[PDB]
Amino acid sequence: GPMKFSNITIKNFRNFEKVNINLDNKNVIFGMNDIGKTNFLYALRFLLDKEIRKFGFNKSDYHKHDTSKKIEIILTLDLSNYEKDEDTKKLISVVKGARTSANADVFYIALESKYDDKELYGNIILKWGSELDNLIDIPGRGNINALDNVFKVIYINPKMLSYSIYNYLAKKKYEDKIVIYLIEEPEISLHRSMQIALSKQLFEQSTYKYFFLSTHSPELLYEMDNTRLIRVHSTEKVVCSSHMYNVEEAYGSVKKKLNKALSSALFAERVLLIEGPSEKILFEKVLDEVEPEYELNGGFLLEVGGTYFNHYVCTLNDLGITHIIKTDNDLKSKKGKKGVYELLGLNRCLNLLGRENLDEITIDIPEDIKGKKKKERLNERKKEIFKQYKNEVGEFLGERIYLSEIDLENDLYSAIGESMKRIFENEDPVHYLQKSKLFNMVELVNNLSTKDCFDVFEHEKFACLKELVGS
Amino acid sequence: MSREQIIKDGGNILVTAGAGSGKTTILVSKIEADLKENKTHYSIAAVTFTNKAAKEIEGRLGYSSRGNFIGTNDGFVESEIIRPFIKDAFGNDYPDNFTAEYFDNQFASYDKGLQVLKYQNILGTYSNPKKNFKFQLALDILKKSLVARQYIFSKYFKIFIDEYQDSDKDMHNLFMYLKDQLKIKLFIVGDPKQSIYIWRGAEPENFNGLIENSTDFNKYHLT
Amino acid sequence: MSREQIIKDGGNILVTAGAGSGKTTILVSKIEADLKENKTHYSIAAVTFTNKAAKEIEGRLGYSSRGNFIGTNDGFVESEIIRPFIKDAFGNDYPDNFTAEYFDNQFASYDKGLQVLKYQNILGTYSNPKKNFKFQLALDILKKSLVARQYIFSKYFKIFIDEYQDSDKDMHNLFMYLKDQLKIKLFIVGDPKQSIYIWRGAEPENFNGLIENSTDFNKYHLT
């Protein structure tokens, strides 16, 4: 693989006590603690940009203003594909020596700084090379370091004209050096469509490579592909989590909706996954009637539709975001019917915990049986298979995965029984609600009372909302 | 017109120049043209025994941000290939900084030279005036170190070689190793009539063979 | 109370400490106190053979803008006195950068050692285990170079000396030359019962004579 960033071990910086967060060329930093993201970007500027090193470090630049500690930010680089990667050649041409033949792939770039009290100016002492144990003397011919011929920081901070012309300027002038775009909040004066355009040029075109993107709007993350997403936790003590966000060719067709839905959820402290928009309407009504500040204390309703949760689960778990999923046990037929049914409702929850896909179970449904009787038989079979796999359901509850008894609507009817009958005035309100999920769900929500909302919220079969709200 | 042939260049270029210098102006023109048309991080290396030639080359050329090396072959090697990578190739025990004195050892066996270099830090030459041990050491350090090969590949895309008739088999092997095993372009100019340093150790017969037997290096005639 | 005597210090201080280290804490306290009360550009030099002692001294001490040297006596000399001023004192012909190997020459005559050092670049020791040639070379470079004397005078106002019973006549002469001919304060601590490195070349009889015959160095007793 081409040359890629690997890790940065920021220690005793303005806010970073001791963090070793992985990197990979295309980087995205977001989340809480805007000062944390700003400090991370300025740490990269200190490690790579000469325009920031010359000012040195101050008393405030250290962690808790404690001048005793030493700033040590160590960028880690991975080198491979020497004969075809131009940037690898750019990095290894300037470095003369200090590269042990044992490990020609790893390359450290550290930055040691100790504060002196006789002058109140912490000197930036670059010490880069290939091994942490042994460092040779850096040339440092005056103000320009040897690193200055390799890594030049192009700082973008607000105007689409500048973004459009930086491509031309770098292509025609900065070919020799490696460009590292440290973009900090480019959504300041860009429209939603402008944010989409900038995301398309960033995450798809090769003109922006090795870029560190700071964003606060989900629109800038609509085209994420093989990047490294970095999320800063909400605590004042900065904790950052990293995840390779790459879409498989299986999800390539649905990549647009996948990214559009996941980008908004990336900024939520707690994310709840749902299948259909009727579930969205019901959960939104319940939350608005019990806790309208769910979006405030950290919450989201991620509508995934079909596909699988595997990509969503990996992305949400790697960033450390609270993981909540409520799903419906659905038995879908495939190829020849009448005895062939998959277990997507359960096959998913198995795939989230790994294991293996269940075989296509066979249900003996007579041909003459149809309509209400067929649905009753399917519900009985779903109840039987749910009662059979009690251990798997227990593991899902232990791993914050919620699976319905048969379907979501049956759980809703169990939580509130008389309210459904009063609203729909039918002997079988569940069947009527399944007849047209959207319109009937809207009608149910419009006539849904606050007491009914509280009963739904406090029921154990709807514990997803309780987990989303939190303490 | 030979000026058009000089401008059009193309890959490796061999020019049969005359005496009374002459090679200096075409060397300067080629260096300037290569620096001008280039738009990447690739550097250039021009090497010449004559120290005042290096001084005038540096004087008539401007300051370059990218490192361009002007010096002598032995100085070139001992500066960038031996000095940095001697510890990496042969362990931390080998010294990194040293001075070259040809009239210290005067040995007869290669093994004895190896022992005295390893232990007593002394670096000299063979009793035989032919051949230079420095280029053999450069070959040895290049062969068993991938870092040195990568650095030489990435740094210089075309190495300029001057007064190649003075070259013996050792730096000939070094230059061919850089050209073939490293796919690095070479710009070599030499005078067939300048075979006067034979007693010093020069054996141009390999250069004449490359003129005749080799086909990659096109031959050019300069008036 | 001996803490008051430690704090009040005053000029040169000689302390008859016991075994089981002990000297390390008083050394650290004296170094810290001298750095704290000082308000000028004068530096300090603490020297110790034990490498891990130097490592812990550096670790427990903070970063100092003014250059404070922590190392071994031979390393101290070969670092600041020999390496920079060897070209100034003995001409540009003498090498500046070199490595010390004691087991190379094993000579018997001083003139032969001088010739081999001048020509073959090799630096070793006498066949006699007593005495060190490095400190004699330091004396020689100090005697005929005013620049070195001025640098030593201006840089360090008090040089701290540790495990002085290991010292032989050569570094004894160097330290006395710095104390008398350069008027540089000396802080020396030594254990009379630590005479175990005699075979290595240590001859503490001069130290005992300074304890008895000399009057400038006041003797102090530590519990």
End-to-end CA distance of chain C: 10
> Residues A217, A195: contact at Cβ < 8 Å?
yes
CA distance A116 to chain C (A): 6
B95: which chain C residues are within 8 Å (Cβ-Cβ)? Answer: 99
Give alpha helix (H) positions in A148-295: 160-173, 192-203, 255-266, 277-290
Count Cβ atoms within 10 A of the Cβ of residue B137 and give its class: 0-12 exposed, 13-18 middle, 19 or more buried: buried
For residue A176, what are its two tokens?
């020799």
Return the residue of C nearest to A68 by Cα: C62
Decide if C62 touches A, using CB distance below 8 A. yes
- In one-letter notation, the amino acid at residue B141 is I
Query: Does A298 show up as a binding residue in the annotation?
Result: no
Q: How was this structure determined?
A: cryo-EM
How far apart (Å, rounded) are the C-alpha atoms in residues A260 and B82? Answer: 56
- For A54, which DSSP code? T
Q: How far is CA A393 from the centre of its chain?
A: 26
DSSP A196: H
From chain C residues 64-93, the ones with a CB under 8 A of any chain A CB are 64-66
C-alpha span between A297 and A293 (Å, rounded): 6
By CA distance, what is B80's nearest residue in A?
A: A96
The answer to whether A38 and A61 are in contact (CB under 8 A) is no
CB A259 within 8 A of CB A223: yes
Residues of chain C positioned with their CB less than 8 A from the CB of B122: 120-122
CB-based contacts of A121: which residues, under 8 Å, 6+ apart?
A: A56, A57
- Tell me the backbone φ, ψ of residue B48, rounded to 5 degrees: -150, 135
> Please, are residues A388 and A346 in contact by the beta-carbon 8 Å criterion?
no
Answer whether B88's CB lies under 8 Å from A100's CB. Answer: yes
Query: Across-strand partners of B218?
Result: B13
| C21 annotated as a binding-site residue | yes
Asked if residues B136 and B22 have their Cβ atoms less than 8 Å apart, the reply is: no
Contact with chain A for residue C199, Cβ under 8 A: no
What span, in angstroms and rounded, lies between the C-alpha atoms of C58 and C182?
27
DSSP secondary structure string for all residues of A116-179: -TTTT-B--EEEEES-SS--PPP---TTS-GGGGTEEEEEE---HHHHHHHHHHHHHH-SSSEE
- The whole-angstrom separation of Cα A395 and Cα A402 is 10
Given the structure tokens 């303005």, which residue do they identify?
A14
Question: Whole-angstrom Cα distance, residue C150 to residue C180?
Answer: 14
The four Cα atoms A24, A29, A31, A32 give a dihedral, to 10 degrees, of 120
A34 annotated among ligand-binding-site residues: yes
Within 10 angstroms of residue C63's Cβ, the number of other Cβ atoms is 17
Tokens of A400: 């914050």
Resolution (A): 3.6
Amino acid at C131: K
Closest CA to C170 of C216, C203, C215: C203
Give B99's contacts in chain C (Cβ within 8 Å): 95, 121
Residue with tokens 């006596």: C73
Contact assessment for residue B35 and residue B11, using Cβ atoms and an 8 Å cutoff: no
Alpha-helix runs per DSSP H in chain C: 2-8, 23-37, 51-60, 73-77, 83-90, 110-120, 133-143, 146-155, 169-180, 205-212
> Is residue A113 within 8 Å of residue A123, measured between CB atoms?
yes
Tokens representing B205? 């017969």
- Taking the C-alpha atoms of residue B184 and residue B159, their distance in angstroms, rounded to an integer, is 7
Q: Answer yes or no: do C64 and A116 touch at CB < 8 A.
A: yes
Question: For the residues of A80-127, what is the DSSP string, one character each?
Answer: --TTT-HHHHHHHHH--S---TT-SSEEEEEEEE---TTTT-B--EEE
User: Whole-angstrom Cα distance, residue A55 to residue A123?
Assistant: 9
On chain B, the residues whose CB falls within 8 A of the CB of A177 are: 41
Q: Which two tokens stand for residue C60?
A: 């427990």
CA atoms within 13 A on the CB side of B10: 9
Task: Indicate the residue of C95, C97, C120 with minimum beta-carbon distance to B120.
Answer: C120
- Closest by CA position to A87, among listed A100, A97, A77: A77
- Give the chain B residue whose CA is nearest to the CA of A131: B88
Contact B3, B26 (CB under 8 A): no
Q: From the list A83, A92, A176, which residue is nearest B151 (CB)?
A: A92
Fill in the DSSP letter of residue A66. -
* CA within 13 Å, CB half, C88: 14
Question: What tokens were used for A221?
Answer: 């993350």
Order of all β-strands in the sheet with A401-403: A301-303, A270-274, A322-327, A401-403
CB contact under 8 A, B41 and A88: no
What CA–CA distance (Å, rounded) separates C168 from C196?
Answer: 13
| Conformation bin of residue B127: beta by default, left when phi > 0, alpha when psi is -120 to 50 | alpha
Q: How far is CA A417 from CA A402, A410, A412, A457, in A?
A: 21, 10, 8, 14
From chain B, pick out residues whose CB is under 8 angstroms from the CB of C95. Answer: 99
SS3 assignment for chain B: CHHHHHHHCCCCEEEECCCCCCHHHHHHHHHHHHHHHCCCCCEEEEECCCHHHHHHHHHHCCCCCCCCEEECHHHHHHHHHHHHHHHHHHCCCCCCCCCCCCCCCCECCHHHHHHHHHHHCCCCCECCCCCCHHHHHHHHHHHCCHHHHHHHHHHEEEEEECCHHHCCHHHHHHHHHHHHCCCCEEEEECCCCCCCCCCCCCCCHHHHHHHHCCCCCEEEECC
Using CA atoms, how far residue B92 sits from B87, B111, B122, C121, in Å, is 5, 21, 17, 20
Tell me how many residue pairs between chain A and chain C have CB atoms under 8 A apart.
11
Interface probe for A, chosen from C38, C42, C60, C63 (most Cβ of A below 10 Å), is: C63
Other Cβ atoms less than 10 A from the Cβ of A289: the count is 18
Whole-number Å distance between alpha carbons of C141 and C121: 17
Give whole-number Cα distances, C143 to C89, C148, C154, C181, in Å: 9, 9, 16, 10
User: What tokens were used for A129?
Assistant: 């090379």
Q: Which residues of A touch C63 (CB under 8 A)?
A: 114-116
SS3 category, A2: coil
List the structure tokens of A117: 């009290």
- Which residues does A13 contact at the CB level (< 8 Å), separation at least 6? A39, A43, A61, A62, A63, A71, A73
Instruction: Compute the nearest-CA separation of A56 from chain C (Å).
Output: 15
Q: What angle do CA B150, A7, A38 make, to 5 degrees?
A: 125
Residue type, B150: Q
Structure tokens given for A185? 């909040």
**CB contact at 8 A, B130 and B15:** no
**B41 interface with A at CB cutoff 8 Å:** yes
For chain A, percent helix, then strand, then coil, each to nearest 5? 40, 20, 40
Please count the other Cβ atoms lying within 10 Å of the Cβ belonging to residue A281.
19
Could you tell me if C86 and C95 are in contact, meaning their C-beta atoms sit under 8 angstroms apart?
A: yes
Tell if the CB–CB gap between B99 and C95 is shorter than 8 Å.
Answer: yes
C118 lies within 8 A of chain A by CB: no
Under DSSP, the state recorded for C165 is G
As a dihedral over the C-alpha atoms of residue A160, residue A162, residue A165, residue A169, rounded to 10 degrees, the angle is: -160
DSSP at A424: H
C-alpha distance across the termini of chain B, in Å:
10
**Helices A390-398 and A372-388: angle between axes, nearest 10 degrees:** 70
Tell me the residue type at A170.
A
Distance CA A310, CA A349 (A): 9
Angle between helices B23-37 and B51-60 (to 10 degrees): 40
C-alpha–C-alpha distance, residues A370 and A428, integer Å: 16
Q: Phi and psi of A33, rounded to 5°? A: 60, 65
Burial call C191-201: b when 16+ CB within 10 Å, e when fewer = beebbebeeeb
Instruction: Please give the C-alpha separations between residue A26 and each of A238, A406, B208, in angstroms, as whole numbers.
Output: 21, 43, 53
How far is residue B122's CA from residue B115's CA, in Å, rounded to a whole number? 10
**Residue A217 — φ and ψ, nearest 5°?**
-110, 130
User: H/E element holding A423?
Assistant: helix A418-424
Q: Which two tokens stand for residue C149?
A: 């004397």
Of B106, B145, B138, the residue nearest B122 (C-alpha)? B106
How many helices (H) and strands (E) chain C has is answered by 10, 6
The secondary structure of chain C in percent helix, strand, coil, rounded to multiples of 5, reads 45, 15, 40
Work out whether strand A178-184 and strand A151-156 pair parallel, antiparallel, or are unpaired.
parallel
Count the alpha carbons within 13 Å of B120 in the hemisphere toward its beta carbon. 19
